[PDB]
Amino acid sequence: NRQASEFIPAQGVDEKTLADAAQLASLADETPEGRSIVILAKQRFNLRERDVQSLHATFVPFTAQSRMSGINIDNRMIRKGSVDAIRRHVEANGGHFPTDVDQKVDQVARQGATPLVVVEGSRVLGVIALKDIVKG
Numbered sequence: 348n349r350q351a352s353e354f355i356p357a358q359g360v361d362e363k364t365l366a367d368a369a370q371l372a373s374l375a376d377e378t379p380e381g382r383s384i385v386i387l388a389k390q391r392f393n394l395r396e397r398d399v400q401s402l403h404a405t406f407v408p409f410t411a412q413s414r415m416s417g418i419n420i421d422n423r424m425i426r427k428g429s430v431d432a433i434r435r436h437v438e439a440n441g442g443h444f445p446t447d448v449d450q451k452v453d454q455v456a457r458q459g460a461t462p463l464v465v466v467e468g469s470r471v472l473g474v475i476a477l478k479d480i481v482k483g
């Protein structure tokens with residue numbers, strides 16, 4: 348299986364902020380890995396999932412075809428998915444993928460992890476490296 352092990356902020360982003368957005372944007376995904384990330388911040392920050400309907404917010408379902416899930420709330424929007432997936436989401440909003448964030452995604456892969464990318468609105472806040480539960 349795949350689980351988030353570490354997250355890194357994008358260009359000018361704080362690591363704590365990145366872990367938090369990955370957690371709430373995963374509350375809406377029904378994939379088992381989306382729970383793996385909600386754990387990742389849990390052990391690192393010891394925080395709890397955020398109730399979207401208590402904020403009158405919305406969950407954004409996770410689809411594998413785009414490889415993306417997220418969450419919407421009355422003051423923010425969050426999206427997370429594959430690096431190619433997030434780049435397309437930013438361009439549709441009209442945002443851009445910062446070089447530093449693309450570099451963090453690649454170093455996540457060069458390290459044998461699956462780099463997901465997380466954005467807020469149309470800009471990437473950080474990249475997430477997942478360790479593989481199973482490895483040959």
Ligand SMILES: Nc1ncnc2c1ncn2[C@@H]1O[C@H](COP(=O)(O)OP(=O)(O)NP(=O)(O)O)[C@@H](O)[C@H]1O
Nearest residue numbers: 373376380381409411412414415416427428429463
């Ligand atoms: N909680 C999540 N939210 C957004 N994206 C995720 C999440 N978990 C994983 N992803 C990314 O979405 C990709 C999965 O997309 P996809 O290839 O369509 O599913 P899949 O791996 O074939 N499904 P499975 O058969 O269970 O492995 C993963 O490789 C991650 O990079």
